[PDB]
Paper text:
Phytochromes are biliproteins of plants, bacteria and fungi that use red light as a source of information to regulate fundamental physiological processes, such as photosynthesis, seed germination, flowering and shade avoidance. The molecular architecture of phytochromes shares a common photosensory core module (PCM), which is composed of PAS (Per/Arnt/Sim), GAF (cGMP phosphodiesterase/adenyl cyclase/FhlA) and PHY (phytochrome-specific) domain4–6. Bacterial phytochromes can be grouped into prototypical and bathy phytochromes, in which the red-absorbing Pr and far-red-absorbing Pfr are the thermodynamically stable states, respectively. The conjugate Meta-F and Pfr crystal structures has been obtained from the engineered photoactivatable near-IR fluorescent protein (Agp2-PAiRFP2), derived from the bathy phytochrome Agp2 from Agrobacterium fabrum.
Here we describe the crystal structure of a Meta-F intermediate of the PCM of a bathy phytochrome at 2.16 Å resolution formed during the Pfr→Pr phototransformation. The intermediate has been generated by irradiating crystals of the parent Pfr state at ambient temperature and identified as Meta-F by resonance Raman (RR) spectroscopy. The asymmetric unit includes two molecules (Mol A and B), which differ in terms of the intermolecular interactions of their N-termini. Compared to the Pfr structure, the overall fold of the protein and specifically the α-helical segment of the tongue remained unchanged but significant structural changes were observed for the chromophore and its binding pocket as reflected by the ΔFo (FoMeta-F−FoPfr) electron density maps. The C-D methine bridge has undergone the expected E→Z isomerization as also shown by 2mFo-DFc and several types of omit electron density maps. The resulting ZZZssa stereochemistry of the chromophore structure exhibits a deviation of the tilt angle between neighbouring C and D pyrrole rings (38.9° and 44.5° for Mol A and Mol B, respectively). The first group includes a rearrangement of the extended hydrogen bond network surrounding the chromophore, most likely initiated by the almost 180° rotation of ring D and facilitated by conformational changes of the participating amino acid residues and movements of ordered water molecules. In the structure of the Meta-F sub-states of Mol A and Mol B, these Pr characteristic features including the concomitant re-positioning of Trp440 away from the sterically pressing Gln190 were not visible. Instead, the amino acid segments 439–448 in Mol A and 439–442 in Mol B were not resolved in the electron density map, indicating a disordering of the polypeptide backbone.
Author numbering:
A (entry chain A), C (entry chain A): 9 to 79, 84 to 119, 127 to 438, 449 to 506
B (entry chain A): 103 to 119, 127 to 408
Write the structure that this text describes.
C-alpha cells in the first residue's frame, strides 16, 4: 500500500539490521525469550537460544554487569563488553513494556563540535554551519536539515554534499513521506541508523511469542526500517543513513539527515558523540528561535510607536493612513498590503485587482466580527479569488475602527511563486514527492505564523485606539 | 429598549425613560499595568459616582485578588485581599464571558416573576443575555451583609479570557440608564484592550531583561578559568532573573544559599528529591510539602 | 533614424505646441525677431509680426511690465497679464543666449502636498506615496516614478494608475529611450508638458533667422517634443504628459512621469505648485538616501565588530571563518558567498559549482593585487563562467590575508532572475524597449554599488588585520 502510509506498525517489524544481533529477555533478565537468527554466528553459539538462561548463554560475569546497568526507558550504553567466550561487543541495553532488550555490535569529539556552533547568533547561521560541520566530522556523502512545516510537510533548509550529488535545498515533501507514527517514534529515539538499505534483514525468533505479542523494537537501535523507506533510499542511490531528531519546546522541529552512497555504520562511541551534539544543537536552535521571535515583536512595537507618534501631530488621521499604510508592510512579512477606509481602497505591492476589492471587503466585514481574521487559502473563502491567486492567495485583515468596517489588509502570493525505481513504483522518488507537494499547495500561500497573528492583534489595538482618540476630529471632517 | 435573540427566543427589555471617549483618553497613555489599574478605579468612581469601585483580578486557580480600589473615606478597604474561586462560581464566570456589563439595581428589592417560568414544553426562559436578569439570592445576600444595595460590574477580557472584573458598589439603590451603560461598556472594552497590550509589553520587558542578565554572566564566564568558583561567587545575582525570596546553588554535593532558603541541613534531602524528578529539565512547585513531607517545617 | 538617438537636436525643433503662442525678441525687448504662426489668432493681430516693435505689438504697458520682470535663466511667471486689446494671458518670460522669449497661455496646493510627504522615513515610503498623491491631486490617468540606473537605463519604481490601464511597475528600459541630450535638457527645465501628442504643431517664423541661427527653445515650456517620443506615446494610448525632473546631489536621479489618455494642459498656477512640490520631493529623497546609506554603513560596522569580538576568543581563526563566513552575507546584498582559504572552498547560497572555483580563485589571485576586485559581468573576465551565469553572474572578492591568496567571495545571480504602431515601427513600444533591455543585461548581475565597495574595503582591513594578529597562532597550527 502507498496511500494509508500512517498505518504501517514500524515499531514491530519482526526484523533487525545485519550489523548487530539482539537478545530479548524477561524483565529480571533470567530467561532468553527471543533472539535474532544471527546470534549463533556473532556470539559463537548454536541451536535455539530461547528457553536457555541469560547466564547459560552469556555467562555470569556479563549478566551480572548488565543487571547492574539497568536502574525513563533510555538505553544504557556499554562499550567493549566481553562474553564468556572472549568475543568483544558494544552492548546497548534497555527495558520497555517489561521486556529487556540486549543489542550487540562486534567491536572530546562532541565538545569540539558543540564549540563550533555555540556562538551562532541566528537560526540561519546555526543551520547553515551545522550541515557543513556534520559532513566534515562524520564523513557522510550528504547531510541535510529537514524542517517540519506546521501541516507536517518538510522543507530542506540546509545542505552539504559531495559536488557530484544532486541538491535538495529549498525543496518540500508531503507530510505523508515521514508518516505520523514515524514522527512519534523519532520523539523517543533521537538517533537512528540504517547501515545497508540493500542488506538482508535478520528475523527475530519468534516474531510473535506464544501469547500473541510482537517484539516492540521502538528503542532498539538495530530495528529494521520500513521497506517503503528503504526502497525510497535505493531509488535515490542511498545505501545508508543516519538521522538525528531536533527537539524544540518538547516537539519534533525537524531532522538532521545524513545520506551515504555506500554502506556505513557508526560505532557506539561515535553515535554517542553525535547524539550529544544533536542535543546541544536542539537547545541552541530553541534559544535562537526564541530570540528571533523577541526581536521580531520588539521591532513591530517600535514601528507602531513611530506611526502613533505621527498620528499625534496630525489633524486628519485618515489622510495619514492613506499616505502611510504601505509602511505597515514592515510589521508582518507579506507581498502586498492595502487600506480599506470610507469604502475606498488603496493598495501597495501584490494585491487583488482593484475591482475585486469590494467583494473582498464585504466578505471581511461579515466574518471579522471586530477581530483579526486570516487565511492562507483565499479561494476557499471566496471562490472568485481563484483567478487572482497568483498575486494574492493569502490574506490577513486587521480592523482599524471600533465603529466602522475599515480594515488594513495584508496579502501573500501563492507559495509556488516564492520557491531508478523498484517494484513499488515511481511514487518513491524525491521528484514525485516534490510534485505531489506542489500540487497540494496550489492556490495557497505561506501560512500566517503565530508571531504574525500576535503582531496583528497588537496592531489592531493600536489602530482601533488611535481611531477612537481621533473620532470627533474625523466626524468634524 | 434592549432587544436580542438567543436559542431562537426573542427577548425585549423595557426601561422607562463623548463620555466614553473622554474616559478612554484619560487611560490611553498609561504605560504600566499598575498605572492603568490604579487610575481606572479612581476615574470610574468620579465618572459614574458609585460609593466604591474595585478591580478584582483572577489568579490562575480562579481565586480573586482586589488589585485596585477607590472608595468613600468611611467605607472599609478590601485592597490586597483575596477570595476563594468558589465565591464567583464557574457558571458565573462563563456568563460574564457573554454579558460584559451587569447591573443589580436593588439587592433588597422585590423580584418580578416571568410568567410562565416553565413553558408548556418544559423549557425555562434563558436570560443569559438579558440585562434585567435577577441575580442569585446567594450573591444578593452577600451584598446586603456588606451594606451594599446596588452594583455594576464590567468583564475585563484579555486574550479571549476573563482576566478579572471592574466591580462598583453603591450603599443605596442605583441604576445606570442605557446611554450611561453603553458608554461604560465601551470604556471597559478599551480598558481591556489597553491592559492586554500593557501585559504583553511587560512580559517582553521581563524576558528582554532576563536575556541581558544571562549575557552579562556568560561574558564573565568567558574570562574565568574556573566556572564553579564563578558560580559560587555569582549565584545570588540569578535572583534577578525570576522573582523569588531566596536562591541557592547545589554543586559538587555542596550547598550555598542566599536570602530565604531551607535550612542548610535540609538541603541534601531536597537535592536527592530534585535529582530524582528533574530528568534534566526545569522542575517547579508552589507546594513543596506535597513533594517532601518534611518541608512542612520550613514552609 | 532609430539607432543614433542622441543626435536629434531637441532644443531647436522649430515648432511649439498648440496650447500657447510664442514671441522672440532681442535682449533689450525692443524688436520682434520671431513669432509662432498662431500669434495673430490668439493675440488678435494680423500679418507678419517680425520687424514690428514689442510696443507696437503688445502695447507700452505690457512691454514695460515685462522688462521689469527680467532682472540664472529661470523663467519669470506672470499670471493674468493683459495685452492692450484686453485679452488675458499667463505669460512665461526668459532670456537665453541673449534672445528674449515670451510665451502666452490664454487664461496652499504645494504646501499641502509637501506636508503629506515630509514625514516619509524611507525612500520606499516616499516614492510609493508620491505617485498616489500626485495622481489624486493633479488627476492624471497614470503617474510613475522612473529611476535611472548607473548606466542610464531606467526602472519604473512606483506607479499609480486607473485600474483598466496596464502596469509598468518593476520594468526597465534602455538608456537610449531617454537620450543623453534629453537628460541634459531635463537638468535645466525641471517641469515639462505635452498637451496633445496628436495635436498639430505650430511653426516658429522664421525657423532659421537671416544669420543662420535656429531658435533655442531649451527653456521654453511651449517647446514641441521629438516626434519619436510623441509617436512612442501614441502607441501607448497616451495623449498627454507631464514630467518633473528629480534632482539629487546635483544630478538627474529620475523623473516623475504623468500620462493622460486624453489631451490635458496644466495651467500656470498648477504648474508652479507642481514644480515646487517636485523640489521638496527631490530634497527629501536626497536626505532619505543619505540616511539609508548611513544606516547601511553603521550596520556593517557593527556586524564586523561582532565577528572581531568572536575572533578575540578563538585560538584558530581559520576554523572560525569556516564556521562563520555565511554571516558575511549580511554586510553586502548578495545571493551567495564563499570562502577560499588554504586552497579549499566553502560556499553558501548561490555560488559557482564547486569544481569551477579553483579557476575562479586563480583568476582572482591574478587581478586582485591585494585590493577589493568586483565585476557585474563575470563571463567577460572568465569565458567559462557563462555556463553558470544563471547562479552567479557577478562577483566581488575581498582579500582576507596580507600574505596568502585567501579571499571571501560574494556572488550575485544574473539580473533576469530577480525580476498599436505608427509609421516608425514597433521599436516604439514599452514591450520592445523592455525586451531590448533584457537582452542587453544577459549574463550580467545587478552592479555592486559604491556603498557595497566601501563596505568591502572596510571589511578587507578588518579581516586582513585580524589575520595578521592571529598569524603566529596559525603558523603554530
Ligand atoms: C506511504 C508511506 C511513505 C513513506 C513512509 C515512511 N518514511 C519513513 C522515514 C523517512 N522518510 C523520509 C523522507 C526523506 N528523506 C530524504 O532524504 C528525502 C529527500 C528528498 C525524503 C523525502 C526521512 C528523512 C525518514 C526518516 C529517516 C530516518 O533515518 O529516520 C518511514 C519510517 C521509516 C522507519 O522504519 O523509521 C516511513 C514508514 N515514505 C514515503 O515516501 C511514502 C510513500
Ligand atoms: C456557594 C456560592 C457562593 C457565591 C456565588 C456567586 N457569586 C456570584 C457573583 C459574584 N461574587 C462576587 C464576589 C465579591 N464581590 C465583592 O465585592 C467581594 C468583596 C469582597 C466579593 C468576594 C462578585 C464580584 C460577583 C459578580 C458580581 C457582578 O455584579 O457580576 C454569583 C453569580 C451571581 C449572578 O447571578 O450573576 C454566584 C452564584 N458567592 C459566595 O460567596 C458563595 C458562598
Ligand atoms: C532613438 C530615440 C528614442 C527615444 C528618444 C527620446 N525619448 C524622449 C523622452 C522620453 N522618453 C521616455 C520614455 C518612456 N516614458 C514612458 O512612459 C515609458 C513607459 C514605458 C518610457 C520608456 C520619457 C519618460 C521621456 C521624457 C518625457 C518627458 O515628458 O520629459 C526624448 C525627448 C523628448 C523631448 O523633446 O524632450 C527623445 C529624443 N525614445 C525611444 O524610445 C527611442 C527609440
Ligand atoms: Cl524555525
Ligand atoms: Cl496581570
Ligand atoms: Cl535610490
Amino acid at each position: 500500500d502507498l496511500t494509508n502510509c500512517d498505518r504501517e506498525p514500524i515499531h514491530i517489524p519482526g526484523y533487525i539490521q545485519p550489523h548487530g544481533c539482539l537478545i530479548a529477555c524477561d524483565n529480571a533478565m533470567r530467561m532468553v525469550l527471543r533472539h535474532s537468527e544471527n546470534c549463533g554466528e556473532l556470539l559463537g553459539l548454536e541451536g535455539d537460544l530461547n528457553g536457555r538462561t541469560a547466564e547459560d548463554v552469556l555467562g555470569k560475569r556479563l549478566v551480572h554487569d548488565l543487571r547492574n546497568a539497568l536502574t525513563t526507558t533510555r538505553p544504557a550504553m556499554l562499550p567493549a563488553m566481553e562474553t564468556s567466550d572472549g568475543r568483544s561487543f558494544d552492548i546497548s541495553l534497555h527495558r520497555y513494556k517489561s521486556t529487556t532488550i540486549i543489542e550487540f555490535e562486534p567491536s572530546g569529539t562532541a565538545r569540539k563540535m558543540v564549540d563550533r556552533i555555540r556562538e551562532a547568533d541566528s537560526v540561519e547561521s546555526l543551520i547553515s554551519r551545522t550541515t557543513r560541520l556534520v559532513k566534515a566530522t562524520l564523513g557522510y556523502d550528504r547531510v541535510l536539515i529537514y524542517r517540519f512545516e506546521e501541516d507536517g510537510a518538510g522543507k530542506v533548509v540546509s545542505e552539504a554534499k559531495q559536488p557530484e550529488l544532486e541538491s535538495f535545498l529549498g525543496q518540500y515533501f508531503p507530510a505523508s513521506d515521514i508518516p505520523q507514527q514515524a514522527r512519534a517514534l523519532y520523539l523517543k529515539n533521537t538517533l537512528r541508523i540504517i547501515s545497508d538499505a540493500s542488506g538482508t534483514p535478520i528475523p527475530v525468533l519468534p516474531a510473535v511469542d506464544v501469547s500473541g505479542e510482537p517484539l516492540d523494537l521502538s528503542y532498539a537501535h538495530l530495528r529494521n526500517f520500513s521497506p517503503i523507506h528503504c526502497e525510497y533510499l535505493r531509488n535515490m542511490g542511498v545505501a545508508a543513513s543516519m538521522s538525528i531528531s531536533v527537539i524544540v519546546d518538547d516537539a519534533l522541529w525537524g531532522l538532521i539527515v545524513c545520506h551515504h552512497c555506500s554502506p556505513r555504520v557508526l560505532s557506539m562511541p561515535v553515535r554517542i558523540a553525535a547524539a550529544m551534539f544533536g542535543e546541544f544543537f536542539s537547545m541552541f536552535l530553541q534559544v535562537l528561535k526564541q530570540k528571533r521571535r523577541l526581536d521580531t515583536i520588539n521591532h513591530a512595537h517600535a514601528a507602531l510607536d513611530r506611526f502613533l507618534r505621527l498620528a499625534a501631530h496630525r489633524a486628519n488621521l485618515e489622510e495619514l493612513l492613506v499616505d502611510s499604510f504601505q509602511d505597515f508592510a514592515r510589521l508582518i512579512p507579506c507581498d502586498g498590503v492595502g487600506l480599506w477606509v470610507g469604502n475606498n481602497w488603496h493598495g501597495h505591492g501584490a494585491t487583488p485587482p482593484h475591482d475585486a476589492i469590494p467583494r473582498l471587503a464585504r466578505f471581511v466585514a461579515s466574518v471579522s466580527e471586530g477581530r483579526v481574521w486570516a487565511t492562507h487559502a483565499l479561494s476557499q473563502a471566496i471562490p472568485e479569488a481563484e483567478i487572482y491567486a497568483d498575486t494574492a492567495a493569502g490574506m490577513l485583515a486587521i480592523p482599524i475602527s471600533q465603529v466602522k468596517s475599515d480594515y488594513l489588509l495584508f496579502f501573500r502570493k501563492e507559495i509556488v511563486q516564492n520557491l531508478e525505481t523498484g517494484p513499488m513504483g515511481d511514487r518513491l522518488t524525491p521528484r514525485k514527492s516534490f510534485a505531489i507537494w506542489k500540487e497540494s499547495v496550489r492556490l495557497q500561500a505561506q501560512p500566517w505564523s503565530e508571531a504574525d497573528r500576535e503582531i496583528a492583534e497588537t496592531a489592531r489595538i493600536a489602530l482601533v485606539g488611535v481611531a477612537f482618540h481621533h473620532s470627533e476630529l474625523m466626524a468634524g471632517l
